[PDB]
């Protein structure tokens, strides 16, 4: 399937409490592999996945130097936006950026993106074409004009189409045993009694990778999608994921309901009943 390289950046001002909190987190697919945090004892870019041990000390030095530069850039950005939006220095504010590229199974580029947000709202975003920007409001329009007349989209397009894809491939090669693996879900159903003759059936799916999975309850063929209570797939702290889906049913008639689990580690979808 298609793979992705994502960098999540967040800058948070904290007036009185010093200079802003700055963090960068990188993901190859759903797996975290690099991190930077300004609050660390001594802030460095560092690995979060074992396979990144294959990069030498020159890699980590350059990433750290990049991050140090980016921190200063987002400090300025934070101060700039105070002027633009006419806000006081006493309040805390957040800038978030998501940047990445996605490649197909053959390693060729599918799409690239970068989006900025201020205090949780869309600020400025690169378009599908990778040539132009789109601004959410008038503060972002000022930024839009700065970036057009400096040719920022040209430098970013080069990074996304060239540099981003080339390193993603290397990460997929170096981390193949981790990134290209497939852990199958182990599933089971739990029974939970309730008032007024009802029963909650919960279908669990544990220890699977990658994260993409479908849980569904059925009754005589039809999928109970709207009547399902659900949680978003969630990491289990070891590079695997888990999920559960539940539905309320009448007492005694539990066997007529069935849970179906669709995952790429399951050549045939699981079907559990109780």
């Amino acid at each position: 399937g298609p793979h992705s390289l994502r960098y999540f950046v967040t800058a948070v001002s904290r007036p009185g409490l010093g200079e802003p909190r700055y963090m960068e987190v990188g993901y190859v697919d759903d797996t975290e592999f690099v991190r930077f945090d300004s609050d660390a004892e001594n802030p460095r870019y560092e690995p979060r996945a074992r396979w990144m041990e294959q990069e030498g000390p020159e890699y980590w030095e350059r990433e750290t130097q990049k991050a140090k530069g980016n921190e200063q850039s987002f400090r300025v950005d934070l101060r700039t936006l105070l002027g633009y939006y006419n806000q006081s220095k006493g309040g805390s504010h957040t800038i978030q950026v998501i940047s990445g590229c996605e490649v197909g199974s053959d390693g060729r580029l599918l799409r690239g993106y970068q989006q900025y947000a201020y205090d949780g709202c869309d600020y400025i975003a690169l378009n599908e074409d990778l040539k132009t920007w789109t601004a959410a409001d008038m503060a972002a329009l000022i930024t839009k004009h700065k970036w057009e007349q400096a040719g920022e989209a040209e430098r970013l397009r080069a990074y996304l189409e060239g540099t981003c894809v080339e390193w993603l491939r290397r990460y997929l090669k170096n981390g193949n045993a981790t990134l290209l693996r497939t852990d199958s879900p182990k599933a089971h159903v739990t029974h939970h009694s309730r008032p007024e003759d009802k029963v909650t059936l919960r279908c669990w799916a544990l220890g699977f990778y990658p994260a993409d999975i479908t849980l569904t309850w059925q009754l005589n063929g039809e999928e109970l999608i709207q009547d399902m209570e659900l949680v978003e797939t969630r990491p289990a702290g070891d590079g695997t994921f888990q999920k559960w889906a539940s539905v309320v049913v009448p007492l005694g008639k539990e066997q007529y309901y069935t849970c179906h689990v669709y995952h790429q580690g399951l050549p045939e979808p699981l079907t559990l009943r109780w």
Binding site: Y7, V9, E24, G26, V34, Y45, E63, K66, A67, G69, N70, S73, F74, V76, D77, T80, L81, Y84, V97, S99, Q114, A139, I142, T143, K146, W147, A150, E152, R155, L156, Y159, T163, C164, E166, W167
Partner: peptide
């Protein structure tokens, strides 16, 4: 390889 230049707003 993280982005090395976020241009200022």
């Amino acid at each position: 390889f993280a982005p090395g230049n976020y241009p200022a707003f």
